Design an enzyme around this catalytic site. Structure first.
Site, PDB file in Angstrom:
ATOM      1  N   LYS A  98      31.987  26.780  29.823  1.00  0.00           N
ATOM      2  CA  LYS A  98      31.117  26.838  30.994  1.00  0.00           C
ATOM      3  C   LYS A  98      30.354  28.169  31.090  1.00  0.00           C
ATOM      4  O   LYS A  98      29.166  28.192  31.404  1.00  0.00           O
ATOM      5  CB  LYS A  98      31.954  26.601  32.255  1.00  0.00           C
ATOM      6  CG  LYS A  98      31.180  26.576  33.554  1.00  0.00           C
ATOM      7  CD  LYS A  98      32.045  26.050  34.708  1.00  0.00           C
ATOM      8  CE  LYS A  98      33.332  26.853  34.897  1.00  0.00           C
ATOM      9  NZ  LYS A  98      34.440  26.393  34.016  1.00  0.00           N
ATOM     10  N   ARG A 141      35.767  24.789  44.740  1.00  0.00           N
ATOM     11  CA  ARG A 141      36.940  24.599  43.891  1.00  0.00           C
ATOM     12  C   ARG A 141      37.790  23.430  44.373  1.00  0.00           C
ATOM     13  O   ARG A 141      38.530  22.832  43.593  1.00  0.00           O
ATOM     14  CB  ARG A 141      37.787  25.875  43.855  1.00  0.00           C
ATOM     15  CG  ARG A 141      38.548  26.105  42.553  1.00  0.00           C
ATOM     16  CD  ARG A 141      37.599  26.199  41.372  1.00  0.00           C
ATOM     17  NE  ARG A 141      38.239  26.768  40.188  1.00  0.00           N
ATOM     18  CZ  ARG A 141      38.845  26.055  39.245  1.00  0.00           C
ATOM     19  NH1 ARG A 141      38.908  24.735  39.344  1.00  0.00           N
ATOM     20  NH2 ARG A 141      39.392  26.663  38.200  1.00  0.00           N
ATOM     21  N   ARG A 146      47.168  30.353  20.228  1.00  0.00           N
ATOM     22  CA  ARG A 146      47.261  31.763  19.857  1.00  0.00           C
ATOM     23  C   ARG A 146      48.702  32.218  19.637  1.00  0.00           C
ATOM     24  O   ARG A 146      49.553  32.099  20.522  1.00  0.00           O
ATOM     25  CB  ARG A 146      46.600  32.646  20.913  1.00  0.00           C
ATOM     26  CG  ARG A 146      46.501  34.112  20.503  1.00  0.00           C
ATOM     27  CD  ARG A 146      45.617  34.892  21.460  1.00  0.00           C
ATOM     28  NE  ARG A 146      44.396  34.156  21.778  1.00  0.00           N
ATOM     29  CZ  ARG A 146      43.894  34.040  23.002  1.00  0.00           C
ATOM     30  NH1 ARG A 146      44.505  34.618  24.028  1.00  0.00           N
ATOM     31  NH2 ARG A 146      42.781  33.349  23.201  1.00  0.00           N
ATOM     32  N   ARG A 203      51.907  34.670  24.287  1.00  0.00           N
ATOM     33  CA  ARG A 203      51.746  35.097  25.670  1.00  0.00           C
ATOM     34  C   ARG A 203      52.122  33.938  26.578  1.00  0.00           C
ATOM     35  O   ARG A 203      51.889  32.779  26.234  1.00  0.00           O
ATOM     36  CB  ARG A 203      50.311  35.540  25.967  1.00  0.00           C
ATOM     37  CG  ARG A 203      49.787  36.672  25.112  1.00  0.00           C
ATOM     38  CD  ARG A 203      48.567  37.299  25.765  1.00  0.00           C
ATOM     39  NE  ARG A 203      47.703  37.972  24.800  1.00  0.00           N
ATOM     40  CZ  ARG A 203      46.587  37.444  24.307  1.00  0.00           C
ATOM     41  NH1 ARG A 203      46.196  36.238  24.696  1.00  0.00           N
ATOM     42  NH2 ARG A 203      45.858  38.123  23.432  1.00  0.00           N
ATOM     43  N   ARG A 217      48.078  24.241  33.885  1.00  0.00           N
ATOM     44  CA  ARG A 217      46.773  24.742  34.311  1.00  0.00           C
ATOM     45  C   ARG A 217      45.713  23.650  34.260  1.00  0.00           C
ATOM     46  O   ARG A 217      44.946  23.461  35.213  1.00  0.00           O
ATOM     47  CB  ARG A 217      46.340  25.916  33.439  1.00  0.00           C
ATOM     48  CG  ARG A 217      45.004  26.525  33.852  1.00  0.00           C
ATOM     49  CD  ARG A 217      44.520  27.554  32.828  1.00  0.00           C
ATOM     50  NE  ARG A 217      43.253  28.157  33.233  1.00  0.00           N
ATOM     51  CZ  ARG A 217      42.466  28.874  32.435  1.00  0.00           C
ATOM     52  NH1 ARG A 217      42.801  29.078  31.166  1.00  0.00           N
ATOM     53  NH2 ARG A 217      41.330  29.377  32.903  1.00  0.00           N
TER      54      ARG A 217
END
Length: 208
Positions: free
Chosen positions: A15, A91, A130, A153, A164
């Site tokens: 985005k 949102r 990652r 992480r 999420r």
């Protein structure tokens, strides 16, 4: 000459990059939630100094204050001149309702919404790949010749990214439906090269 737009997309959908390309071509003011609040506070507007009194104290910004921030921003001169590309607000569906009220009060009409679609499984794999070596700190996604010599992480663990994405999907769905029911939503296939995604966006925007 001037367009009133929203841009939407799940985390990892690119985005931000598309927004910058949209500005370069169409000259609309790109307005993210962060930009709006930073502007209000750094420029010390009435709502901004109000918002700062909560933020400095580590408290949440009340909806009433956020709505004022938005109305203030959309009241600026650049909005009349160049139009805008709102990013990250609204949102929730409640903020969508608040926004519509503000736009109606300002005499402004939304003209289009760029909705970048990417399959959530593709997003999950892209955001949770990652991997990091313990002592050399070298980053991967690709190698891994030893499963136990790496860590992730917390932000990048599959379960975290999955949550999420699920939360973002659930919050965004009624907003997309709200505006799609009015024919404002344009779905863009986001699983293309950056210039190809923008190519489809360009077609949509020039034909508004």
């Amino acid at each position: 000459g001037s367009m009133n737009l929203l841009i939407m997309g799940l985390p990892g959908a690119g985005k931000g990059t598309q927004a910058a390309k949209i500005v370069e071509q169409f000259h609309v003011a790109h307005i993210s939630t962060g930009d709006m609040f930073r502007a209000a506070m750094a420029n010390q507007t009435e709502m901004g100094v109000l918002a700062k009194s909560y933020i400095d104290k580590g408290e949440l910004v009340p909806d009433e204050v956020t709505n004022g921030i938005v109305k203030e921003r959309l009241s600026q001169d650049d909005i009349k001149e160049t139009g805008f590309l709102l990013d990250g607000y609204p949102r929730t569906i409640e903020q969508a309702h608040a926004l519509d009220k503000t736009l109606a009060e300002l005499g402004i009409e939304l003209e289009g919404i760029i909705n970048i679609e990417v399959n959530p499984d593709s997003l999950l794999e892209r955001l949770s790949g990652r991997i990091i070596h313990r002592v050399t700190g070298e980053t991967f996604h690709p190698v891994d010749y030893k499963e136990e010599d790496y860590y992730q992480r917390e932000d990048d663990k599959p379960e975290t990214v999955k949550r999420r994405l699920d939360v973002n999907i659930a919050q965004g769905e009624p907003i997309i439906a709200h505006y799609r029911a009015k024919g404002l939503v344009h779905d863009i296939e986001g699983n293309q090269d950056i210039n190809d995604v923008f190519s489809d966006i360009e077609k949509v925007l020039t034909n508004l």
